[PDB]
């Protein structure tokens, strides 16, 4: 119950390893970072996250 929704989006691109340009799948673009064990390598342009 406490558990919770998670926004969706495609990676527009990877600014830095952790810095990302992602257009919200439900709207505008944002500068954001990764998590950790997500695989900064996998994160790639147009990848839905």
């Amino acid at each position: 119950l406490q558990s919770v929704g998670q926004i969706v989006g495609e990676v527009l691109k990877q600014l830095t390893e952790e810095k990302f340009i992602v257009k919200a799948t439900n709207g505008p673009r944002y500068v954001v970072g990764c998590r950790r064990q997500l695989d900064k390598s996998k994160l790639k342009p147009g990848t839905r996250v």
Partner: protein, 70 residues
């Protein structure tokens, strides 16, 4: 200290901001950008903003509520 205030403000940059495209700049330390959300505002530009690099419409880092150009 001069180095402090400059670094301390770094927080202003943050990390989870809202990209915007640059539009026009009323003049010194100001301009109108576009929001990816569709907003288009007169916003304030951080002294750091290595300006020179401000063509006519840049994809731009926007503070969220301070809503200004990072």
């Amino acid at each position: 200290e001069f180095l402090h205030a400059q670094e301390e403000v770094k927080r202003i940059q943050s990390i989870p901001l809202v990209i915007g495209q640059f539009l026009e700049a009323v003049d010194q330390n100001t301009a109108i950008v576009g929001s990816t959300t569709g907003s288009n505002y007169y916003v304030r530009i951080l002294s750091t903003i290595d300006r020179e690099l401000l063509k006519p419409n840049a994809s731009v880092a926007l503070h969220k509520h301070s809503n200004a150009l990072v």
